[PDB]
Structures are given as structure tokens and as C-alpha cells.
Design a protein around this ligand. Structure first.
Ligand SMILES: [Zn+2]
Ligand SMILES: [Zn+2]
Ligand SMILES: [Zn+2]
Ligand SMILES: [Zn+2]
Ligand SMILES: [Zn+2]
Length: 212
């Protein structure tokens, strides 16, 4: 497939098939990869970077998919900045929405707790990443640190896990009594019924599956 990117030489551009009517420059033997976020081609320089750390990262260290943001700036509605060190990743203004269990009721409780104290999601992440570094909080992607260069989706996935642990560690005395009065759901954080508003309001889902 003929491909022309931001950094392709002019001669390449003028040789593409024409439309229908009613510092780096790409070498001949080089290749292109499509940004997983914006679908636009960029020169694929990952192999080069392996022995030259001077080349900007072009992939998420967690899912290994390519993203163009650190390399030359990605633009798309819905794109907040799709590749970054985790501690600096832009998760968007709505990242607290459904952050706990995809459960708006549980999530609103956390939003209220943070807003009451004038805290932002950023403050919560910073505190959570301190705990992560001490080994007090844990991640499924267990090798991720605040310094890992990762994408929006992988960062968000870990932010949900850190946030759940942050929530877990809030003393009951610091939450409204209407929150703490609710009995634990037998099925815990993975309950499938908590997507229904009534069930979500009735039971606490910040807990684990009941076993014995
Ligand atoms: Zn190119
Ligand atoms: Zn990723
Ligand atoms: Zn992009
Ligand atoms: Zn992007
Ligand atoms: Zn439940």
C-alpha cells in the first residue's frame, strides 16, 4: 500500500493517486505504522530506538501497540494525549465517571468524598502511586510504575485498580452514614447486578465475594 505521512519526502506525496473529481525524513527502505489512536501513519522507528534511546517512544510498554503522541503529537477528538509516562497521563475530565466497578453510584460517592476535601483525580493518583511504589497498593499489570510509558486505555485500566484501593482505604467515619449503612453485596466488587441503579444504591459493592 502506498503510504504518505507527515515526514514523507515531497516526491512521495506528488506520486500518490490523485483525488476523484465530481526534522526526520522517511527513507526508501523504512516502513510506517498506524497510530492505534488516530489511525494516521507515522514512520516505524521502534527497531532503531532499541539501540538509540534518543528516538521518542512510539508504543505502549504494556500492550505494545503503536501510538504517535510522544513522537510528534497526536490529534483527535477524544484523544487527551494518548501516550505518556503513567504519572503524567491525561485521563480526561470524566475519568471518575464509573471509575469504581463501572458503578455510577459507587463512583459518585468517591467524587463527593474528593470534592468535599477539594481533591482532584490527579491528587488521588499521586497518592495512589506513592502506595504502589511502597508495595502497599497492587496492580494486575504488576510491573507498571508511575514512570512506565503507557497508553490511555492501559493507564485507565490501572487507574481503576488504584482508585478502587484508594476508596477501600477511606475510613467509614469519613463517609456519609447513608453510605456506610448499606449492607455488603454477597457477590462483592464483581457483582453483575450493580449496573442496575436500585441494586447499586441498596448494597455496598466496595467489598470482596463472600465465600465461607
Ligand atoms: Zn512517512
Ligand atoms: Zn497500552
Ligand atoms: Zn496518533
Ligand atoms: Zn491519540
Ligand atoms: Zn450486588
Amino acid at each position: 500500500p502506498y503510504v504518505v505521512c507527515r515526514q514523507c519526502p515531497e516526491y512521495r506525496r506528488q506520486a500518490a493517486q490523485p483525488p476523484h473529481c465530481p526534522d526526520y525524513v522517511c527513507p526508501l527502505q523504512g516502513s510506517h505504522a498506524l497510530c492505534t489512536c488516530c489511525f494516521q501513519p507515522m514512520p516505524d522507528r521502534r527497531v532503531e530506538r532499541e539501540q538509540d534511546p534518543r528516538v521518542a517512544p512510539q508504543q505502549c510498554a504494556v500492550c505494545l501497540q503503536p501510538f504517535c503522541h510522544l513522537y510528534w503529537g497526536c490529534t483527535r477528538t477524544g484523544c487527551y494525549g494518548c501516550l505518556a509516562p503513567f504519572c503524567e497521563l491525561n485521563l480526561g475530565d470524566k475519568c471518575l465517571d464509573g471509575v469504581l466497578n463501572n458503578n455510577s453510584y459507587e463512583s459518585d460517592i468517591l467524587k463527593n468524598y474528593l470534592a468535599t476535601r477539594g481533591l482532584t483525580w490527579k491528587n488521588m493518583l499521586t497518592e495512589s502511586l506513592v502506595a504502589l511504589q511502597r508495595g502497599v497498593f497492587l496492580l494486575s499489570d504488576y510491573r507498571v510504575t508511575g514512570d512506565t510509558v503507557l497508553c490511555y486505555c492501559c493507564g485507565l485500566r490501572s487507574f481503576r485498580e488504584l482508585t478502587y484501593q484508594y476508596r477501600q482505604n477511606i475510613p467509614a467515619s469519613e463517609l456519609p452514614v447513608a453510605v456506610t449503612s448499606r449492607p455488603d453485596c454477597y457477590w462483592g466488587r464483581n457483582c453483575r447486578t450493580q449496573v442496575k441503579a436500585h441494586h447499586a444504591m441498596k448494597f455496598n459493592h466496595i467489598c470482596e465475594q463472600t465465600r465461607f
